[PDB]
Ligand binder design. Structure first.
Ligand SMILES: [Zn+2]
Length: 258
């Protein structure tokens, strides 16, 4: 009876195995645009992904992750509200069974079709495993996807999904450039939060971009053909792998723009 997104093991159940689920800095949250505070001291974000080295794509049973070589400062995030250098280790998505839902964060209660998470860890802690035990260990860049025109830069990911349909499958995925997934503007909202899947650790500085990317109907459709189950087990479509918005509690969302 492992955690998941079903009726008997879904998000409303995670607190029984992971108490922090009811913590003070849980993610995701609804981003009220009118109460977010513009903070002029926020620096622009610095994304340096030109030397990124993708290695593999893996179906881990709750999403698919594109993994990168994080043994050197090849793909890093600096600036914004961050102190120090954060290395990209993996990116993944959350999506819905319908185009009207799928994002984890919401903007004025609006839900997007999907949400991309670029996960980075603070080099000062030496490895991802140590970074998750710290309050400033991770920086996650969140990008919303809306259905419209196609995103050419995402097609390489969509085409390989047939080869990792079931949990535990992996495939070589080299020379993928994550710059093709960024929007034109890097304006963002930021708040202190957590991982949105177990262990739900409160170690994330969230950076959510204001500008969504558009993807085609057909591209998002291919995400919905993945399976939560392993090969040879009954088929359960990998859809609605998103956690609902959690209480903001004692936190303030800051905006880099007005
Ligand atoms: Zn995520």
């Amino acid at each position: 009876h492992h955690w998941g997104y079903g009726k008997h093991n879904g998000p409303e159940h995670w607190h029984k195995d992971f108490p922090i689920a009811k913590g003070e800095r849980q993610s995701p949250v609804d981003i009220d645009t009118h109460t977010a505070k513009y903070d002029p001291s926020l620096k622009p974000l610095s994304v340096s992904y030109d030397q990124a080295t993708s290695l593999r794509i893996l179906n881990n049973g709750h999403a698919f992750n594109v993994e990168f070589d994080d043994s050197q400062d090849k793909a890093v995030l600096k600036g914004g509200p961050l102190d120090g250098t954060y290395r990209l280790i993996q990116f993944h998505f959350h999506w819905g069974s319908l185009d009207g839902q799928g994002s984890e964060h919401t903007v004025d209660k609006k839900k997007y079709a999907a949400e991309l998470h670029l996960v980075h860890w603070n080099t000062k802690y030496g490895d991802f495993g140590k970074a998750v035990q710290q309050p400033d260990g991770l920086a996650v860049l969140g990008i919303f996807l809306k259905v419209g025109s196609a995103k050419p830069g995402l097609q390489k990911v969509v085409d390989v999904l047939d080869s990792i349909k079931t949990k535990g499958k992996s495939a070589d995925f080299t020379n993928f450039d994550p710059r093709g997934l960024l929007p034109e503007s890097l304006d963002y909202w930021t708040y202190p939060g957590s991982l949105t899947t177990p262990p739900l650790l409160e170690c994330v500085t969230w950076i959510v971009l204001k500008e969504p990317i558009s993807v085609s109907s057909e591209q998002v459709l291919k995400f919905r053909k993945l399976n939560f189950n392993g090969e040879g087990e009954p088929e359960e479509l990998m859809v609605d792998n998103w956690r609902p918005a959690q209480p903001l509690k004692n936190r303030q969302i800051k905006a880099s723009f007005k």
